[PDB]
C-alpha cells in the first residue's frame, strides 16, 4: 500500500491532481425541467467521482467490495461538498455548473427542495468565512470518502485517515498558524463534516421522495446509488 510512504507535500499534490473537472449543464424553470437538468448533471458527476476515488491514495488498496461500500455511503456527501466548495465565491448562489448558477427562489420550484438549498447555502457561507483553502478542501473531500462508511464494516483506512489528518495540520503550520489555531481550525473543519452528513441524509430522503413522485426518471446509476441507502 503506497499511500503511507508518501509525504504530506506528495499527498496534497496527489489529491489536487486527482481533482475531477467542472462539468457544464445542458444548455426559467419548472419542477420537471429543473430536476431534469440536475439529475442529468449529477449522473455525469458520479462517473467522474468514481474515477477520482481510484486516484485517492490508499483507496485502491481495498477490496472491490470495500470500495463499493465506501462510495455507496459517501456519494451524496461528496457531491454536496463539491457543490458548496465551488459556490463559495458566489454568496447566495449555488453554482451547480458554470452555466447553471441557482439561487434560493429557484429552489422553491421543486417540492421539498428549498430546505436543502438553505442548508447548502449555509455551509457555503461558513466555508467562505473560514477562508477554506483548496488544499484543505481536497483533504476534507478525501476524509469523507474513507470515513463515512468505515464504522459500518479497517486499520488500513484509519492509518490513511490519520495520514490525511497529518496532512491537514501540515498545511496549517505552513499558513503560519499557531499550535492553538491549528487544533481549533482542525476541529472547526471536521465538525462541518457532521453537517454535511446531515445534509446528505436529508437529500437522500428528498431524492427518494422524488423518485416516488415519478417527476423525472433517474439514470440506472443514480437509482443504484440511491437504493444502497434502504
Amino acid at each position: 500500500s503506497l499511500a503511507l510512504s508518501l509525504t504530506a507535500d506528495q499527498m496534497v499534490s496527489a489529491l489536487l491532481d486527482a481533482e475531477p473537472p467542472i462539468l457544464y449543464s445542458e444548455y426559467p424553470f419548472s419542477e420537471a425541467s429543473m430536476m431534469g437538468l440536475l439529475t442529468n448533471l449529477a449522473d455525469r458527476e458520479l462517473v467522474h467521482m468514481i474515477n477520482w476515488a481510484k486516484r485517492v491514495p490508499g483507496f485502491v488498496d481495498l477490496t472491490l467490495h470495500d470500495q463499493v461500500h465506501l462510495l455507496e455511503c459517501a456519494w451524496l456527501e461528496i457531491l454536496m461538498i463539491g457543490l458548496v466548495w465551488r459556490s463559495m465565491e458566489h454568496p447566495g448562489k449555488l453554482l451547480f455548473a458554470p452555466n447553471l448558477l441557482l439561487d434560493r427562489n429557484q429552489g422553491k420550484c421543486v417540492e421539498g427542495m428549498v430546505e436543502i438549498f438553505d442548508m447548502l447555502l449555509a455551509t457555503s457561507s461558513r466555508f467562505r468565512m473560514m477562508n477554506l483553502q483548496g488544499e484543505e478542501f481536497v483533504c476534507l473531500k478525501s476524509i469523507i470518502l474513507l470515513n463515512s462508511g468505515v464504522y459500518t464494516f479497517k486499520d488500513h483506512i484509519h492509518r490513511v485517515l490519520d495520514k490525511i489528518t497529518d496532512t491537514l495540520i501540515h498545511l496549517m503550520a505552513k499558513a503560519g498558524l499557531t499550535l492553538q489555531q491549528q487544533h481549533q481550525r482542525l476541529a472547526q473543519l471536521l465538525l462541518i463534516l457532521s453537517h454535511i452528513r446531515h445534509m446528505s441524509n436529508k437529500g437522500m430522503e428528498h431524492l427518494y421522495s422524488m423518485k416516488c413522485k415519478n417527476v423525472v426518471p433517474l439514470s440506472d446509476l443514480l437509482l443504484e446509488m440511491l437504493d444502497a441507502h434502504r
Partner: peptide
C-alpha cells in the same frame, strides 16, 4: 451493479 463495472474501468 453498474458501480462494480465502473470501478474496474
Amino acid at each position: 451493479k453498474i458501480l462494480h463495472r465502473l470501478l474496474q474501468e
